[PDB]
Design a protein around this nucleic acid. Structure first.
Ligand SMILES: [Ca+2]
Ligand SMILES: [Ca+2]
Ligand SMILES: [Zn+2]
Lengths: 77, 77, 75, 155
DNA sequence: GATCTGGCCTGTCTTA
DNA sequence: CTGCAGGGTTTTTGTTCCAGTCTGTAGCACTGTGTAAGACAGGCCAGATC
DNA sequence: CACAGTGCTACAGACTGGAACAAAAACCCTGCAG
């Protein structure tokens, strides 16, 4: 295991990014003049995901273990 | 002394003033007015005896280093 | 070249199917890479162990909408 | 609903089992070969998908008809590795613009000199043509050359 | 010694 | 007594313009995140074989 | 038809000042009303 990596679990990061946008979905329900309480079971969220690498990320002295320099960054929106 | 860009500082200024202010920081154009005292070319001085082949005007700010190159094409560029 | 084949053959099909193209472009990821460098000099603890953890956290705090609403300052 | 569209071509090819990146089978969305899409350019229909590539890797590994390496590679239109990530069949915008601008930069570099009269130009002549094209593109349009071409140069 | 073919090597092409 | 219309009353709330004085955004030209090996076609030579 | 900046310069709107005006908000005050 020569890899140092970190990640949020998918479901948890998704429910936090969706619970953050709650202001805008409520305001859209208001402007659209649709009832807030009713018909709340059929939502649909379309999510763009992206993955990319990045060259020459300089290494640190540190303790261990040895790691390559290139990094990979998986993100979504 | 905190590496705050001018535009980031104006962003912070608008933010702290608009919400619950009572602004504390000063606007940009009054910071820029307290500047001309720190840069060179503001205080008077006198060299005794007069300096050799150096102008005696004491208000020169940032000068271009080329120092009067005769840009004409035929010479060194 | 491959991109010439894609831009001369499969453009109408994907614009009709997805509805749009370029709104799903990779530009939205690459730009973020810029952050990854500023967040590795300014705001990341200088240790091999905690570096990824603190970069991930500071990036997720910069990307949230809830603090951007405050930062809009209502014009 | 998840839509994977942010990957460039290198990563889409290597994470779907294709061969990167100057293969004979050019399209990620279609099955046309490099020489075939030279004759015929504008008529093609999107075929490739995830499940079809899984099934085609299965054909390539099981090999039920016992073909040689080249024929079997032709039957699965170049699927020699099992795909693990799923990728929606779309086109990246940014790297498409960069690739097309590098193609037109080679066309201009060709047109400075005369390549359709003299079909075999020397290496020094290539260097001289690129140098004078960059000199001109510095005098007007206010551009300075780049080793690898970012997107701002393309726009 | 004459013959041959597999594979070694080299230059261009493609997305990065 | 009440009801509503319409009288006056003060006090907003803003009404016209030209000296200014100050504040906040627009115009300028340009940034940086896009960063590696692999496929293929042709020439040829070296070692194996008859 | 990326996009959030990158600072300096320029000029747009927010101010006063009396003159004077109207419209309005709302008390109170009279007429004509059962
Ligand atoms: Ca890459
Ligand atoms: Ca990449
Ligand atoms: Zn195709």
């Amino acid at each position: 295991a020569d890899t140092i990596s970190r990640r949020f679990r998918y479901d948890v990061a998704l429910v936090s990014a969706l619970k953050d946008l709650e202001e805008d979905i409520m305001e859209g329900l208001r402007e659209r003049a649709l009832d807030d309480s009713m018909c709340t079971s059929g939502f649909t969220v379309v999510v763009k995901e992206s993955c990319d690498g990045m060259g020459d990320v300089s290494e640190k002295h540190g303790s261990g273990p040895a790691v390559p320099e290139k990094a990979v960054r998986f993100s979504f929106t | 002394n905190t590496f705050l860009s001018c535009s980031q500082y104006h962003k912070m200024y608008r933010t702290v003033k608009a919400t619950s202010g009572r602004q504390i920081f000063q606007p940009l154009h009054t910071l820029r007015n307290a500047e001309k005292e720190l840069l060179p070319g503001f205080h008077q001085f006198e060299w005794q005896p007069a300096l050799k082949n150096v102008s005696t005007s004491w208000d020169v700010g940032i000068i271009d280093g080329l120092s009067g190159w005769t840009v004409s094409v035929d010479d060194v560029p | 070249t491959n991109y010439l084949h894609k831009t001369l053959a499969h453009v109408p099909e994907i614009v009709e199917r997805d509805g749009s193209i370029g709104a799903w472009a990779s530009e939205g990821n690459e730009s973020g890479n810029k952050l990854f460098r500023r967040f590795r000099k300014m705001n990341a603890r200088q240790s091999k162990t905690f570096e990824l953890e603190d970069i991930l956290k500071h990036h997720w705090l910069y990307t949230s909408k809830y603090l951007q609403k405050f930062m809009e300052a209502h014009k | 609903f998840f839509r994977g569209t942010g990957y460039d071509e290198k990563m889409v090819r290597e994470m779907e089992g294709l061969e990167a990146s100057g293969s004979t089978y050019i399209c990620t969305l279609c099955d046309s070969t490099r020489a075939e899409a030279s004759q015929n350019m504008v008529l093609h229909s999107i075929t490739r998908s995830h499940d079809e590539n899984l099934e085609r890797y299965e054909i390539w590994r099981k090999n039920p008809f016992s073909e040689s390496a080249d024929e079997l590679r032709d039957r699965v239109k170049g699927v020699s590795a099992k795909p693990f990530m799923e990728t929606q069949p779309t086109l990246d915008a940014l790297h498409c613009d960069i690739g097309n601008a590098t193609e037109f930069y080679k066309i201009f570099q060709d047109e400075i000199g005369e390549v359709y009269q003299k079909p075999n130009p020397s290496r020094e002549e290539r260097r001289r043509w690129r140098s004078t094209l960059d000199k001109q593109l510095r005098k007007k349009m206010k551009l300075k050359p780049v080793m690898r071409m970012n997107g701002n140069y393309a726009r």
